Design a protein around this nucleic acid. Structure first.
Ligand SMILES: O=c1ccc2ncc(=O)n3c2n1CC3CN1CCC(NCc2cc3c(cn2)OCCC3)CC1
Ligand SMILES: [Mg+2]
Ligand SMILES: [Mg+2]
Lengths: 487, 175, 487, 192
DNA sequence: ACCGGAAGGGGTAATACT
DNA sequence: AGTATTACCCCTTCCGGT
């Protein structure tokens, strides 16, 4: 019974929905490269106990855990995201190890939640490394029951390595996958040259990074589009498949297709070519067949009847039947909660800063824990110095409280330490343990100094980041799947 | 002259409101998700969806030129939606469908919006909880839509839900 | 290739399928009164922690746990059973507390599963009471990972207090719900008269239990169908609704239907009445409407124009529109893996035997635990007798093994006793703990004596069962919703 | 032709093979690991209609039955011609649980009621999958399906043979007929 | 022709951009 | 017309007994 307007209600509702979709539904994050659904699924799979060192678990359990505790949305979208993260032909570096029928590059759909099973991958466990050491912030969920992270540590640059793609209200995002081994060099250059300007950093990074490396091999023609995309943030890259010419015993020529560009359907290609063959298109084709066996890969056979010696038919296929396509790269990402268009150096610097912050936080947490343990152990050894008197006072006590009070007033020891004093086990009274206490204290008081020295010098942090990233790259590396040629 | 119409989404919330309503002066109509954007699609395309036809049949009045307010079946059309972000989108789509087709039905005061208490929607509330909060005529609180400027409302509708994308993006960024 | 023939394959396949359906798909167990799906759902919800003390949890989590761990079937047949076990109009005593839209007696589907929450009820807790004390056998699941129970303890007679209904290959079962107090009286009589023969026990349990008590209130006419069902196992029970005659200010007479028989659809009733009125041949009826509000209950209004004095219209409604219906009671259960039809005395004696076996096994487990616990306390007091020498021996040692050998040689103790001495904390060395150990040893010895005495005489187990059942009945119990009238 | 059929490449009926498999996930998994030259997959849906109980006019309108009849190519009842057969090997491949064993018996009773000469000539085969390395055919991938079941060099198939016609005629009516008392007595007698 | 455990599967919309 | 996260929903069969 209140006279509200229609313009105000319309504007408020539409603005709220648009901001929600833009910030928390579709656009990726510069620091981590994961949408909220992907991050929630990964965290739910990590915390529930699904790890590469354990056997496969049903995807239904992980989907239900994500739907209940963290993600308050439908099940179909969550399962679709989980299936997509485990597809080698869609992700350059998969983040989910799946067992079952997870789909096909053509029109075949994946099986239901009841059949397929899924766990994490060894490369995905590097994204969640040291997440319990207060490396990242935590926030309560929608109902305020449990806590979920705001961003994964992301020890490797997932955003560029796997790419991104999304549609928002008034915006869109498309980022092509890259090669980890060549991104490592760019990150090392950024780490070693922290006092570099924008132009020099951009030039060096573009020199170190050649271009995109799509998971489906293919081919890239030209070099102007990649330069335009890296210099500004919006450019077209021309992708092309491979065609091989072969003959038979009778001398009939043939065309063999074994690779297709990124995000190009297999059944749609064959259907479009067949229909355009039935109609008056191309120049000459006898018949088309598909022989893409499971153990062979992809093999599409096209028969040219008598002429053209497989020279102009290839050009016609390139310019007519989606054998050559375009990728409209447009790098859009969310920084500190706001969308922005960024170049390559911007992403590299943001990732480096995130890694440095994670390292600093982990070092601080470890230092605090080691300091508290050292305090407890020092109190314990001070108690051990007077074992006969301690045991005599403990034995001649009416209850625990008076014993604790006498321990406090005798050894000049405060609380917490006295509780561990009274928590001795007799098994730890032999001389071996009485010397093990000394050894442990000696180790810990040096570990504290080492951690303080690490915290005191940024060069140590940069070296730690470089060493860890180098080890990660050395363990998990790949070649250039996509070959880049000239015009 | 006394009946009321409650438009909801889904058969879950539809049944929950149906089993906890006053059957004398309350009718409930469930939908099947988001509405087709009338402003974008052609008139032929929108006039074919099985849900828009249901809405026009339920209301009973005409559309566009052949609109007669004397054939109205319910004198109170209340748009019920969930409290999440989706509930703020579907409703607005409806707020276009009533504005584009049944334009002289809004400024007379026959359209209202309900306010559920703050659950993730009406599908979680049972029959009893839907009475003393949103459906009891002595406890419920609604909002009545009014029209003051016609050109401003039309231009806002076209800017927000038209076919131009750059203008919508600029408006969203600015405000 | 193999000539597998046609007759052998047909017989093998159909016999296997029919036997599986008969045994583990439809027919319920006599001892527990639950189908495998219900038992698996209850066990999964109990193990996952969804208890009445804790808040409601999403039903998706319970369904996923049940499907992934125990039940290797679809999610529809699991959620349907889960939502059916929490419907007051279907179960006399619900076993699940559900929050959300769980359905309606009409044609409204039960919500979706992402909107509804579910947890256990106090009755299900009594059903799952003392299940971890080796009371029932456990078997591995389909994949062999974990263990699941083969029968729930069933501290109260669920089979007769909730009824059953199922269709199998070659047979079907139908059992009506009863009242808890009347079953308790019969069980008490059976417990106190264990030496009675079949005829006397059957007569006593037929005297104590009057007849079925459906959750939808209603009515029942005659007393021969229930007698036939209880004496032979098959019978027909006639149920009838509740109609009242009222008059308005003008003088028109109206029939108000306020109760309907068991398992009768509310909307189909009105639809059938309207169609039969339209087709005629029923009676002089003005109109039929449903005024059943949420806060009013079932209320169907039928208007008769001027005649029949609202007397023959009632008879026509009885005879033509399902206001008076029949129930084909046929008690079929599974005993030791075999389907049989049983009378009331059999269904009482089997439950009594199950309760006695459960009590015996629980008492044996408790006695074994107490006997194994007393050893550690005996070793502890033996060490406390020579505490100073024990401490001196422990201090003058180089390794824990030397201390163990010295303690074994000195105190004449087992390895377990020496280990318990070694992991004794210092806080338990005060005088208060020294006396507490003595008190605990004395109490443990007294408890061992009591547990042995319980097993010594069988006449105490019956008393224990009677006490527990009396407490359970006094806690939860309703009255006769369905009243019995004459012909 | 049925819209769910995945026809092979060879046009010679003497070398082609048709696989009848329940569901769609199993069919999709088998389509990737099959030899496209001599193997066609026909994915059914749910449980088959009981031809022995329903009337002729009702079983002639079922989508699955019509799809099977169209895919096989031959006629039904007295209009059956063996010369129009397209696949010389119809292989039933179902799951290893009781539900698969029931779908298999429904399909076998359909083929016996409508296309008896196919069973007479031994054109029908049964395929058994490995037990454990598996509660369903949808949990397997293309490589494992090919390595054990669909590989012509390493596989085991069962051939259904019909020696006596009267015994089969009476047994099918006893097991899958309208009567219940005879079926219950048969089940009870054969249980032990 | 329902009552209850089981098998299986498709189709309408928003929102951008090439 | 297709990419990818979002909203929502129905329709065949088996197996008895009245
Ligand atoms: O309403 C309809 C109308 C047509 C239709 N056609 C094919 C089809 O598959 N479906 C059609 N529908 C609906 C529906 C499938 N429906 C929704 C998804 C659900 N997923 C199975 C599942 C879900 C969950 C599980 C396990 N399995 O555990 C955790 C919680 C969620 C299965 C039933
Ligand atoms: Mg919602
Ligand atoms: Mg199965």
């Amino acid at each position: 019974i209140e006279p509200v307007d229609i313009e105000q209600e319309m504007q408020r509702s539409y603005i709220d929905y648009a901001m929600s979709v833009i910030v928390g539904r579709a656009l990726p994050e510069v620091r981590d490269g994961l949408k909220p659904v992907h991050r929630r699924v990964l965290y739910a799979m990590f915390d529930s106990g699904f790890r590469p060192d354990r056997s496969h678990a049903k995807s239904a359990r992980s989907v239900a855990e994500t739907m209940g505790n963290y993600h308050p949305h439908g099940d179909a979208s969550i399962y679709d995201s989980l299936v997509r993260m485990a597809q080698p032909w869609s992700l350059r570096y998969p983040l989910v190890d799946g067992q079952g029928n997870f789909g096909s590059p053509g029109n075949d759909p994946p099986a239901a939640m009841r059949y397929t099973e899924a766990r994490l991958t060894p490369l995905a466990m590097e994204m969640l490394r040291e997440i319990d050491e207060e490396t990242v912030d935590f926030i309560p969920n929608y109902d305020g029951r449990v806590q979920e992270p705001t961003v994964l540590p992301s020890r490797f640059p997932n955003l560029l390595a796997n790419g991104s793609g999304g549609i928002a209200v008034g915006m869109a995002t498309n980022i092509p996958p890259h090669n980890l081994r060549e991104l490592a060099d760019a990150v090392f250059w950024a780490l070693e040259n922290h006092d570099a300007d924008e132009e020099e950093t951009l030039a060096a990074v573009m020199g170190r990074v050649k271009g995109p490396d799509f998971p489906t091999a293919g081919l890239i023609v030209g070099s102007q589009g990649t330069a335009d995309a890296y210099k500004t943030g919006r450019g077209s890259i021309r992708m092309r498949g491979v065609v091989e010419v072969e003959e038979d015993s009778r001398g009939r020529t043939s065309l063999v297709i074994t690779e297709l560009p990124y995000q190009v359907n297999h059944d749609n290609f064959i259907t479009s070519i067949a229909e355009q063959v039935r109609d008056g298109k191309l120049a000459g084709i006898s018949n088309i067949e598909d022989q893409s066996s499971d153990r062979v890969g992809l093999r599409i056979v096209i028969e040219i009847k008598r002429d053209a010696v497989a020279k102009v038919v290839i050009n016609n296929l390139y310019k007519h039947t989606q054998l050559q396509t375009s990728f409209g790269a447009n790098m859009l990402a969310i920084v500190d909660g706001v969308p922005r268009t960024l170049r390559l150096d911007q992403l590299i610097r943001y990732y480096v800063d995130h890694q440095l912050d994670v390292i600093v936080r982990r070092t601080t947490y470890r230092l605090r824990k080691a300091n508290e343990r050292a305090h407890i152990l020092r109190g314990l050894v001070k108690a051990l110095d007077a074992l006969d008197e301690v045991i005599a006072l403990i034995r001649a006590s009416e209850t625990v409280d008076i014993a604790r009070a006498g321990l406090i007033e005798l050894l000049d020891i405060d609380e917490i330490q006295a509780q561990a004093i009274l928590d001795m086990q007799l098994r730890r009274l032999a001389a071996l343990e009485r010397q093990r206490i000394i050894d442990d204290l000696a180790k810990i008081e040096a570990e504290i100094a080492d951690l303080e020295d690490i915290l005191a010098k940024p060069e140590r942090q940069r070296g730690i980041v470089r060493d860890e990233l180098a080890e990660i790259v050395d363990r998990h590396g790949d070649d250039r799947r996509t070959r880049i040629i000239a015009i | 002259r006394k009946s009321e119409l409650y438009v909801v989404e889904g058969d879950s919330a539809g049944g929950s409101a149906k089993s906890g309503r006053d059957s004398m002066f309350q009718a409930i109509l469930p939908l099947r998700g988001k509405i087709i954007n009338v402003e974008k699609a052609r008139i032929d395309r929108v006039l074919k969806n099985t849900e828009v036809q249901a809405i026009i049949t339920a209301l009973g009045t005409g559309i566009h030129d052949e609109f007669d307010i004397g054939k109205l079946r319910y004198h109170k059309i209340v748009l019920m939606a969930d409290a999440d972000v989706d509930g703020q989108h579907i409703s607005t789509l409806l707020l276009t469908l009533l504005f584009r087709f049944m334009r002289p039905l809004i400024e007379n005061g026959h359209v209202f919006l309900a306010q559920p208490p703050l659950y993730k929607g009406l599908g979680e509330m049972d029959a009893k909880e839907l009475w003393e909060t949103t459906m009891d005529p002595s406890v419920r609180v609604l909002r009545q839509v009014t029209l003051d400027d016609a050109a401003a409302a039309d231009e806002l509708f076209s800017i927000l839900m038209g076919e131009d994308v750059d203008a919508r993006r600029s408006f969203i960024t600015r405000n």
